Write an enzyme that holds these catalytic residues in place. Sequence first.
Site, PDB file in Angstrom:
ATOM      1  N   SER A  23       0.821  -1.208   0.000  1.00  0.00           N
ATOM      2  CA  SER A  23       0.000   0.000   0.000  1.00  0.00           C
ATOM      3  C   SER A  23       0.843   1.240   0.000  1.00  0.00           C
ATOM      4  O   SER A  23       0.576   2.098  -0.812  1.00  0.00           O
ATOM      5  CB  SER A  23      -0.930   0.026   1.224  1.00  0.00           C
ATOM      6  OG  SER A  23      -1.923  -0.934   1.006  1.00  0.00           O
ATOM      7  N   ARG A 122     -15.614  -7.409 -10.499  1.00  0.00           N
ATOM      8  CA  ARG A 122     -16.183  -6.093 -10.173  1.00  0.00           C
ATOM      9  C   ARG A 122     -16.193  -5.190 -11.401  1.00  0.00           C
ATOM     10  O   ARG A 122     -15.167  -4.982 -12.049  1.00  0.00           O
ATOM     11  CB  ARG A 122     -15.360  -5.407  -9.100  1.00  0.00           C
ATOM     12  CG  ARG A 122     -15.944  -4.105  -8.610  1.00  0.00           C
ATOM     13  CD  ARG A 122     -15.154  -3.537  -7.444  1.00  0.00           C
ATOM     14  NE  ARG A 122     -15.548  -2.166  -7.122  1.00  0.00           N
ATOM     15  CZ  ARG A 122     -15.732  -1.680  -5.888  1.00  0.00           C
ATOM     16  NH1 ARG A 122     -15.588  -2.446  -4.799  1.00  0.00           N
ATOM     17  NH2 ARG A 122     -16.092  -0.414  -5.742  1.00  0.00           N
ATOM     18  N   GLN A 167      -9.823   2.223  -2.475  1.00  0.00           N
ATOM     19  CA  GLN A 167      -8.590   2.289  -3.306  1.00  0.00           C
ATOM     20  C   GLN A 167      -8.737   3.351  -4.418  1.00  0.00           C
ATOM     21  O   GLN A 167      -7.821   4.120  -4.701  1.00  0.00           O
ATOM     22  CB  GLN A 167      -8.242   0.929  -3.902  1.00  0.00           C
ATOM     23  CG  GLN A 167      -6.862   0.868  -4.501  1.00  0.00           C
ATOM     24  CD  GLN A 167      -6.440  -0.545  -5.007  1.00  0.00           C
ATOM     25  OE1 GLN A 167      -5.347  -0.995  -4.684  1.00  0.00           O
ATOM     26  NE2 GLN A 167      -7.259  -1.169  -5.852  1.00  0.00           N
ATOM     27  N   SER A 194     -13.927   2.694   9.720  1.00  0.00           N
ATOM     28  CA  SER A 194     -12.515   2.391   9.510  1.00  0.00           C
ATOM     29  C   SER A 194     -12.114   2.553   8.050  1.00  0.00           C
ATOM     30  O   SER A 194     -12.534   1.770   7.178  1.00  0.00           O
ATOM     31  CB  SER A 194     -12.212   0.954   9.987  1.00  0.00           C
ATOM     32  OG  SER A 194     -11.079   0.371   9.339  1.00  0.00           O
ATOM     33  N   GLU A 309      -6.040  -8.301  11.283  1.00  0.00           N
ATOM     34  CA  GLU A 309      -5.122  -8.941  10.352  1.00  0.00           C
ATOM     35  C   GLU A 309      -4.066  -9.771  11.085  1.00  0.00           C
ATOM     36  O   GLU A 309      -3.426 -10.668  10.507  1.00  0.00           O
ATOM     37  CB  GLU A 309      -4.488  -7.894   9.439  1.00  0.00           C
ATOM     38  CG  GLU A 309      -3.635  -6.833  10.107  1.00  0.00           C
ATOM     39  CD  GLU A 309      -4.381  -5.623  10.737  1.00  0.00           C
ATOM     40  OE1 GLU A 309      -5.625  -5.645  10.885  1.00  0.00           O
ATOM     41  OE2 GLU A 309      -3.679  -4.634  11.130  1.00  0.00           O
ATOM     42  N   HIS A 338     -15.265 -12.326   5.869  1.00  0.00           N
ATOM     43  CA  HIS A 338     -14.254 -12.024   4.856  1.00  0.00           C
ATOM     44  C   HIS A 338     -14.172 -13.225   3.910  1.00  0.00           C
ATOM     45  O   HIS A 338     -14.612 -14.334   4.254  1.00  0.00           O
ATOM     46  CB  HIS A 338     -12.894 -11.774   5.536  1.00  0.00           C
ATOM     47  CG  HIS A 338     -11.850 -11.138   4.654  1.00  0.00           C
ATOM     48  ND1 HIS A 338     -10.539 -10.980   5.062  1.00  0.00           N
ATOM     49  CD2 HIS A 338     -11.915 -10.610   3.404  1.00  0.00           C
ATOM     50  CE1 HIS A 338      -9.844 -10.396   4.100  1.00  0.00           C
ATOM     51  NE2 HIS A 338     -10.656 -10.161   3.083  1.00  0.00           N
ATOM     52  N   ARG A 342     -10.740 -17.133   8.433  1.00  0.00           N
ATOM     53  CA  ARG A 342      -9.553 -17.580   9.149  1.00  0.00           C
ATOM     54  C   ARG A 342      -9.871 -18.194  10.533  1.00  0.00           C
ATOM     55  O   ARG A 342      -9.006 -18.849  11.070  1.00  0.00           O
ATOM     56  CB  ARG A 342      -8.496 -16.480   9.269  1.00  0.00           C
ATOM     57  CG  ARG A 342      -7.856 -16.065   7.921  1.00  0.00           C
ATOM     58  CD  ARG A 342      -6.829 -14.972   8.017  1.00  0.00           C
ATOM     59  NE  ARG A 342      -6.521 -14.480   6.672  1.00  0.00           N
ATOM     60  CZ  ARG A 342      -7.258 -13.593   5.986  1.00  0.00           C
ATOM     61  NH1 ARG A 342      -8.345 -13.049   6.516  1.00  0.00           N
ATOM     62  NH2 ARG A 342      -6.894 -13.223   4.753  1.00  0.00           N
ATOM     63  N   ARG A 383      -1.264 -14.982   5.407  1.00  0.00           N
ATOM     64  CA  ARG A 383      -1.252 -14.938   6.872  1.00  0.00           C
ATOM     65  C   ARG A 383      -1.357 -16.305   7.514  1.00  0.00           C
ATOM     66  O   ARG A 383      -0.655 -16.549   8.499  1.00  0.00           O
ATOM     67  CB  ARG A 383      -2.361 -14.039   7.412  1.00  0.00           C
ATOM     68  CG  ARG A 383      -2.152 -12.576   7.116  1.00  0.00           C
ATOM     69  CD  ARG A 383      -3.486 -11.866   7.256  1.00  0.00           C
ATOM     70  NE  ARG A 383      -3.681 -10.681   6.443  1.00  0.00           N
ATOM     71  CZ  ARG A 383      -4.830  -9.989   6.410  1.00  0.00           C
ATOM     72  NH1 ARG A 383      -5.881 -10.344   7.176  1.00  0.00           N
ATOM     73  NH2 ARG A 383      -4.914  -8.915   5.623  1.00  0.00           N
ATOM     74  N   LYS A 408       3.506 -15.211  -3.506  1.00  0.00           N
ATOM     75  CA  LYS A 408       2.823 -14.313  -4.428  1.00  0.00           C
ATOM     76  C   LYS A 408       2.709 -12.894  -3.830  1.00  0.00           C
ATOM     77  O   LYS A 408       2.814 -11.908  -4.549  1.00  0.00           O
ATOM     78  CB  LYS A 408       1.467 -14.927  -4.865  1.00  0.00           C
ATOM     79  CG  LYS A 408       1.513 -15.794  -6.149  1.00  0.00           C
ATOM     80  CD  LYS A 408       1.208 -17.347  -5.953  1.00  0.00           C
ATOM     81  CE  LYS A 408       0.990 -18.146  -7.300  1.00  0.00           C
ATOM     82  NZ  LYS A 408       1.970 -19.278  -7.600  1.00  0.00           N
TER      83      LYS A 408
END
Length: 421
Positions: A23, A122, A167, A194, A309, A338, A342, A383, A408
């Site tokens: 980012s 999208r 973004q 956020s 995260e 998400h 996870r 992660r 990646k």
Amino acid sequence: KTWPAPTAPTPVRATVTVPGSKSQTNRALVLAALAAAQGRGASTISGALRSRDTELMLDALQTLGLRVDGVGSELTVSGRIEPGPGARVDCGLAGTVLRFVPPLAALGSVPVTFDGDQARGRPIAPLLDALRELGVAVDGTGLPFRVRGNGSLAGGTVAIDASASSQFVSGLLLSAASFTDGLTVQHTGSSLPSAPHIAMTAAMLRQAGVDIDDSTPNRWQVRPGPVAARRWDIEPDLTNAVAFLSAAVVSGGTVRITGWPRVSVQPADHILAILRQLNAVVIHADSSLEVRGPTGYDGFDVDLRAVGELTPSVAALAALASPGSVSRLSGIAHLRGHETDRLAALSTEINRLGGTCRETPDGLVITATPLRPGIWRAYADHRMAMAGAIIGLRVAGVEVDDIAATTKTLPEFPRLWAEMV
Ligand code: NA
């Protein structure tokens, strides 16, 4: 096939340079390009991520006529926007080039074609409509689209859902200093809880001396002006950094991360608080952070709402607490929604290796217990892969199923992790 996670039967002792945030790397590349284009000077970027996606950004900037030079994470950007005949920018899976580069093309005086290859992806027609509203001479409802540069972008005011298109909003703010009338972005929601990516963008604009006013809720205003040529020192990405610090913590060793900022916009404070509560030594020096792990620690209760995260690394820490220890990780129910769940993944994998992890309405309850060798699944998630690597430091015979999940995103991870151990 599987990747054997190296074990650390003695404490790790290592100085590591963690690659920069993707980012921040892409934001710095745009701000460096604009400063150069404006004639403000050549900038340097130290700590840049080098990955497939950042290579696509570098290529897009060179397509626009800018000179890019460097090696590895040390880059220089210079020259001017002067694309020339038949300029074509490949966008592809780097949804970032599509969102950050068209405003820069509009500053040139020739047409620049943006292309990439689905029906199930999208749609970008609304993005293109917003560019037109601000004065970009762009035709298309999709790919390929052609920005017909005529040396200026008028700018003005646009209303957008900044949460759904964060973004793109960042992309507009990055280039707004070059718009004739500047830019006002009005979020269409009455609340925006956020928006870390928009906030990062705003903070970086201020570092470049751009006049941005974000004092009103749900609204960002940038005035036209020069972007300063800078030495951009990219902060290590916090997620990746924590994986390396976790190796100090679980092994009882030392990891020093270089090129660390005096103050950060990332939530480094929250994770350092947790590590401090596990009785790790934490030293913030010159331009480095060093953590030294204790010989062991017991269970902890932590609410990870502010650092979601970090869940997989934190879960690994919990599984490696002294046997019998109970840890409760809460504030993460929302993570179930998400793309990758996870919580389900972490519970399965800890349990596969002979552990004890229970899913709960607000998170995970982990009972530390001795683990056995096995194949830790990453679920094609970087992660999750790093969490298995942390576990492997202490458990011989842990193999991550496919490390490409990490390479990646962070190509250097497997080599840097092995060099650390
Ligand atoms: Na076990």
